[PDB]
Assembly symmetry: none
Homo-oligomer: 120 residues x 2
Amino acid sequence: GDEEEKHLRDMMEIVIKLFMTGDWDAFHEMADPDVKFQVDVGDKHIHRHGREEVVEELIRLLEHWRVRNIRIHDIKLIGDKLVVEGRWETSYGDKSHDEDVELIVIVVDGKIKKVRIIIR
Amino acid sequence: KHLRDMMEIVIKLFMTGDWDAFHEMADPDVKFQVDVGDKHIHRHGREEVVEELIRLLEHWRVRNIRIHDIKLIGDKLVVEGRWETSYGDKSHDEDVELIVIVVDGKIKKVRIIIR
């Protein structure tokens, strides 16, 4: 009962974020009110909490790279955790800003409770 | 367990930008079926299936994908759901059933049924 429901929720998260175009505008409707967000960009490490703080920060992150989607290289599903290794799908005219990215998404009770993004 | 996660990870190669991940996992004799009312598409062979996915999945504009049921029965995974397909402005929602059979770690059959 509770297990399959959690798995149905995980799959719906994957298709919205990394399949159904970008649809990262829909991140607000799937984010837990107390969602955590930490960005690792080199030696700068950002930490945000709360749905509004996270959405505003994530939107700025996507604006700096002009992210449309994530060209996925590998994905692992570990219980309630999504682990993605990939490369940016940007709107630039070439590959100048397609930096490698790792994304970790924790799903709790059908809502995204934690997002981690590491860019090298 | 691992079998459930492995079968689920396999399905998530429907969404890797390119069909490089499906190609390395597909059995060379993989079957592909798409049943949409009267139109029945049937492709057999790893090369023939990928060319069908290029012509099919790309121009298909899927939105609001909802998962209603997931069942793991041995080597077969059955997913039932609902998405919003569109042609231009016109759009409608329809029920979809995804069936994928993995034989010895390789994708042997992929069937998509749309009521």
